[PDB]
Amino acid sequence: KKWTAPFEPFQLIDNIYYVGTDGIAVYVIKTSQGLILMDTAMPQSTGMIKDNIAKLGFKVADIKLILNTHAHLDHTGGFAEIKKETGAQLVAGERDKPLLEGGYYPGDEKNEDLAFPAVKVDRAVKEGDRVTLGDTTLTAHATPGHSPGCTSWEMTVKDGKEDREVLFFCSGTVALNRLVGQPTYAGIVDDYRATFAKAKAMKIDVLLGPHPEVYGMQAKRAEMKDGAPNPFIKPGELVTYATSLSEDFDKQLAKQTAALEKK
Ligand SMILES: NS(=O)(=O)c1ccc([N+](=O)[O-])cc1
Ligand SMILES: [Zn+2]
Ligand SMILES: [Zn+2]
Ligand SMILES: [Zn+2]
Ligand SMILES: [Zn+2]
Ligand SMILES: [Zn+2]
Ligand SMILES: [Zn+2]
Numbered sequence: 640k641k642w643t644a645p646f647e648p649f650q651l652i653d654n655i656y657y658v659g660t661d662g663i664a665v666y667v668i669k670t671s672q673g674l675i676l677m678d679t680a681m682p683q684s685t686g687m688i689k690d691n692i693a694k695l696g697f698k699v700a701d702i703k704l705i706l707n708t709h710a711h712l713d714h715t716g717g718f719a720e721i722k723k724e725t726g727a728q729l730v731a732g733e734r735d736k737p738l739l740e741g742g743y744y745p746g747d748e749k750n751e752d753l754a755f756p757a758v759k760v761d762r763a764v765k766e767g768d769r770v771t772l773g774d775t776t777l778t779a780h781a782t783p784g785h786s787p788g789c790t791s792w793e794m795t796v797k798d799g800k801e802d803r804e805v806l807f808f809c810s811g812t813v814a815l816n817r818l819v820g821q822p823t824y825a826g827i828v829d830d831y832r833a834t835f836a837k838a839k840a841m842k843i844d845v846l847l848g849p850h851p852e853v854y855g856m857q858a859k860r861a862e863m864k865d866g867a868p869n870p871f872i873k874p875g876e877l878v879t880y881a882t883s884l885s886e887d888f889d890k891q892l893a894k895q896t897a898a899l900e901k902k
Pocket of ligand 4: 711713714849850
């Protein structure tokens with residue numbers, strides 16, 4: 640369904656371009672010294688992603704860096720292919736390196752339906768690390784929980800004369816993760832808690848993420864018009880979204896906890 644369904648690519652704000660599917664967000668960041676690719680999609684969708692890149696007039700061969708938000712197959716599925724064909728370097732949060740290099744789902748390592756083609760991490764990042772290509776720098780923020788190395792990426796764009804701060808938020812959903820009993824990884828609950836709080840304290844103009852549902856992409860795209868305000872600028876949104884995530888987290892934690900009582 641949605642994850643592999645097409646969506647027309649577009650310039651989102653300044654040098655950030657959407658090239659994902661209807662259900663998985665992928666971005667090209669255009670720099671003075673080549674392209675940065677933010678994530679990929681499912682392993683079967685790599686051709687579609689490359690075609691979307693070409694539809695905007697970009698060359699896949701110009702990709703120099705590939706950045707990851709988090710190491711699940713729906714975001715990493717094209718990494719091994721694109722890295723091999725371009726010679727790009729892969730940059731990811733240090734604690735997701737084992738996931739990326741093994742091509743497995745943490746705490747469910749034998750589940751082949753969650754596997755992806757293994758890929759080596761060239762640069763393992765930590766909180767505050769700066770990744771520069773030409774005129775463009777992204778800053779890594781450690782926002783674990785959804786994965787142990789989940790990295791939210793900060794960058795500055797222009798809106799007319801003014802700076803606006805973008806966060807590629809890495810994801811904060813519970814989704815398939817086990818929080819209790821046999822947790823997906825050690826300290827997962829504390830990580831989620833810390834991440835919700837951290838997200839609410841950041842000063843972010845433009846919320847993005849690895850699924851369009853993170854930021855209501857489709858509705859904003861519909862509102863775009865030459866000379867009208869860029870609808871992706873909503874500075875309160877990360878607070879609102881993190882609050883919704885935290886509230887769902889509480890529900891999932893309670894559900895999973897109750898489920899430990901064997902009947
Ligand atoms: N990123 S996620 O947590 O929304 C997610 C990734 C993969 C699957 N999957 O393959 O079933 C489910 C959920
Ligand atoms: Zn088209
Ligand atoms: Zn995920
Ligand atoms: Zn996902
Ligand atoms: Zn290819
Ligand atoms: Zn930070
Ligand atoms: Zn579950």
